[PDB]
Enzyme design. Structure first.
Site, PDB file in Angstrom:
ATOM      1  N   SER A 202      20.506 -15.728  49.448  1.00  0.00           N
ATOM      2  CA  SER A 202      20.124 -16.309  48.164  1.00  0.00           C
ATOM      3  C   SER A 202      18.737 -16.915  48.338  1.00  0.00           C
ATOM      4  CB  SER A 202      21.128 -17.357  47.704  1.00  0.00           C
ATOM      5  OG  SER A 202      20.619 -18.094  46.606  1.00  0.00           O
ATOM      6  N   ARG A 203      17.704 -16.164  47.953  1.00  0.00           N
ATOM      7  CA  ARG A 203      16.339 -16.639  48.131  1.00  0.00           C
ATOM      8  C   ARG A 203      16.075 -17.945  47.402  1.00  0.00           C
ATOM      9  NH1 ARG A 203      11.483 -12.416  49.234  1.00  0.00           N
ATOM     10  NH2 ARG A 203      10.950 -14.169  50.616  1.00  0.00           N
ATOM     11  N   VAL A 204      16.878 -18.282  46.394  1.00  0.00           N
ATOM     12  CA  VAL A 204      16.699 -19.559  45.717  1.00  0.00           C
ATOM     13  C   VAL A 204      16.923 -20.709  46.685  1.00  0.00           C
ATOM     14  CG1 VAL A 204      17.489 -21.027  43.859  1.00  0.00           C
ATOM     15  CG2 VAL A 204      17.348 -18.550  43.513  1.00  0.00           C
ATOM     16  N   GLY A 205      17.975 -20.626  47.492  1.00  0.00           N
ATOM     17  CA  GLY A 205      18.308 -21.687  48.415  1.00  0.00           C
ATOM     18  C   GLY A 205      19.164 -22.766  47.779  1.00  0.00           C
TER      19      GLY A 205
END
Lengths: 73, 116, 192, 138, 73, 116
Positions: A8-11
């Site tokens: 999940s690149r959002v984090g």
């Protein structure tokens, strides 16, 4: 879920403080488990810290299953 | 990446660092199988050097998700190469990798070692 | 296409092939080394048994517990094995044969006691249960007499107690360079 | 004269050949031995045993446990630890022998493990991944 | 360069008399070195002759490398 | 395949069976590469378990006797469940694997084995 590759690149910026804090330890535990898994075919030849990591990581592998229709809080 | 464009010393220091790292990775198999003990101290200093170099790689970013106050390190290449060659030599192979962790220059590494 | 990792696998297997070849010829050198190490110690025990026999024919006045078997209540087993696997089931065949033999003896309602040589048997028989009397590790591919001294001495003491009354080697017989057979034979009750 | 005298440890022989005069310290006292001597068996006491050669010079061999036998022509020395030496100080070389043996054992454990066990895992990486993608007609 | 696969279909007939004379020993030394590449890890359960072949092959390998912009007489 | 539908025991027995087969298929690679003996004992046990499972699936069919001659079978699900559970219990680890080939119920397995 294939946790080895899924990301999940959002984090955790959208995750609660407590869960985000607890995340890192599990993250690195699974990292270690998948990392040393190459020689997991035989736990008879390794050192004992490796055995400890093995057991902890497999236990974290456990606790991951979940029944359907069960809204875990 | 050339002993001319970056100078021979810089080139060869990069060579030495990469050699230490690939030696470590080729060590990982024996490290996992036999452990850390049956391997003699030979290449064990190399393992220490590789780990403390990997941790030495840490530059606290001036924007970094905020863990170390978000400072800009940008330490001069001269200090960097001096510290890296000293590490490759083993001058501070007696100092934990955490001393190299989240720190920049050798002043930072040594002060951290005094802290830890 | 994705042929790349296939090619990588092929190259890796080729490297492993040369690895195995090197390993196997190295093992062959070591085997010739041990096999010439076989006979070097023969004349020692040869002449020694010779003078022993001269004594006993000269002095038949008695036979010690170390030449004639007393009724057995516990039988001892000296089990040799390795610390490195990758040798087929040789050690495993030995373990199977010795387990078969000890099960055969257990119908005689007699306990069994052990002498452990090599990590293979160490694991196998600390899992197999029973009453071990001694365990040895790291023979090295060249051993020392002192290494097995105390191990066999404990066995002799247990014989002196009258608890162990028959003592067995558990080893593998050199049939030839390719053929190997497990062997389990008593030695302390001395055969003619 | 000459007697064929042999000194041997359980591992292998240490001394062999003709000898003229043997001086040891048996299970009882010290004795002198010359060819044609009576048949006797004696227990070797710890210490070095020294024997006189046909050249006029004298050999010495250390013993720590063992047995001695004498015949009018042949002498065999079944010693526990038979070492060609002059003084009970070979501790500096026995440890060297043990270190050589353990080092070669270390080489065994490394090269067996490092080469194979690594390669053992490696060669078995993704075989089924390829086996299933055979039947792909595309 | 990998000598194991590179080749000129003309052969030393296009070399220099002395070079044509002498290069064969190096070629066969390289061949031998390739034959014995796997055993570099042990170098201790060999016979002397194979070890010597290994040493000379290592030496010629060392020799083979040359730097950039380095024309040679 | 629903536990609220199939009954708990059915569900769990099936799942365990598939699990066993999965490990066996996985280890097929290494056992092809390596010696079957150089493996952990529990691994080998599971291997034999799964092979006997495969055999216990092999069944004669009422029309299949056309190319064989052996009379086909119809096995009530209860027999199936009990037999598979008994196998998974290892109640039969002393039983030759041939005793499970081309059979019906577990009682047929008993008859075949004692016959053999």
């Amino acid at each position: 879920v294939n946790a080895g590759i899924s990301v999940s690149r959002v984090g955790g910026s959208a995750q609660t403080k407590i869960i985000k804090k607890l995340s890192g330890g599990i993250r690195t535990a699974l990292a270690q488990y998948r990392e040393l898994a190459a020689f997991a075919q035989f736990a008879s030849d390794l050192d004992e810290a490796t055995r400890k990591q093995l057991e902890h990581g497999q236990r974290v592998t456990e606790l991951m299953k979940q029944k359907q229709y069960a809204p875990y809080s | 990446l050339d002993p001319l464009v970056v100078g021979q010393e810089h080139y060869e220091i990069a060579r030495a660092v990469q050699n230490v790292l690939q030696r470590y990775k080729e060590l990982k198999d024996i490290i996992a199988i036999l452990g850390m003990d049956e391997l003699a101290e030979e290449d064990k200093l190399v393992v220490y050097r590789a780990r403390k170099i990997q941790r030495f790689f840490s530059q606290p970013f001036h924007v970094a998700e905020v863990f170390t106050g978000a400072p800009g390190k940008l330490v001069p290449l001269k200090e960097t190469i001096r510290g890296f060659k000293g590490l490759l030599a083993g001058e501070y192979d007696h100092i934990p990798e955490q001393a190299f962790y989240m720190v920049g220059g050798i002043d930072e590494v040594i002060a951290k070692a005094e802290k830890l | 296409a994705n042929l790349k990792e296939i090619r990588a696998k092929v190259a890796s297997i080729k490297s492993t092939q040369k690895i195995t070849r090197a390993m196997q010829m190295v093992a062959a050198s070591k085997m010739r080394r041990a096999q010439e190490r076989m006979a070097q110690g023969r004349p020692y025990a040869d002449n020694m048994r010779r003078v022993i026999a001269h004594l006993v024919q000269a002095n038949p006045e008695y036979k010690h517990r170390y030449m004639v078997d007393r009724p057995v209540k516990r039988v001892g087993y000296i089990i040799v094995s390795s610390d490195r696997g990758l040798a087929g089931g040789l050690n495993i065949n030995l373990f199977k044969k010795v387990v078969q033999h000890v099960k055969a003896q257990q119908e005689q309602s007699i306990e069994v006691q052990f002498a452990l040589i090599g990590q293979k048997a160490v694991s196998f028989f600390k899992n197999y249960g029973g009453k071990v009397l001694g365990a040895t590790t790291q023979i090295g591919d060249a051993p020392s007499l002192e290494q097995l001294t105390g191990s066999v001495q404990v066995m002799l003491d247990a014989f002196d107690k009258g608890e162990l009354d028959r003592i067995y080697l558990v080893s593998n017989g050199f049939v030839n360079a390719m053929t190997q057979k497990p062997k389990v034979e008593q030695l302390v009750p001395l055969a003619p | 004269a000459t007697m064929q005298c042999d000194v041997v440890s359980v591992k292998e022989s240490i001394y062999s050949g003709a000898v003229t005069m043997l001086i040891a310290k048996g299970a009882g006292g010290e004795l002198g031995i010359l060819p044609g001597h009576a048949p006797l068996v004696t227990l070797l006491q710890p210490g070095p045993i020294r024997v006189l050669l046909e050249n006029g010079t004298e050999e010495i061999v250390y013993v720590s446990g063992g047995v001695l036998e004498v015949q009018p022509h042949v002498v065999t020395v079944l010693a526990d630890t038979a070492i060609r030496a002059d003084n009970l100080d070979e501790a500096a070389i026995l440890e060297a022998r043990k270190n050589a043996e353990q080092l070669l054992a270390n080489q065994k454990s490394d090269l067996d493990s490092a080469a194979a066990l690594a390669a053992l895992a490696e060669t078995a990486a993704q075989l089924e991944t390829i086996r299933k993608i055979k039947n792909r007609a595309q």
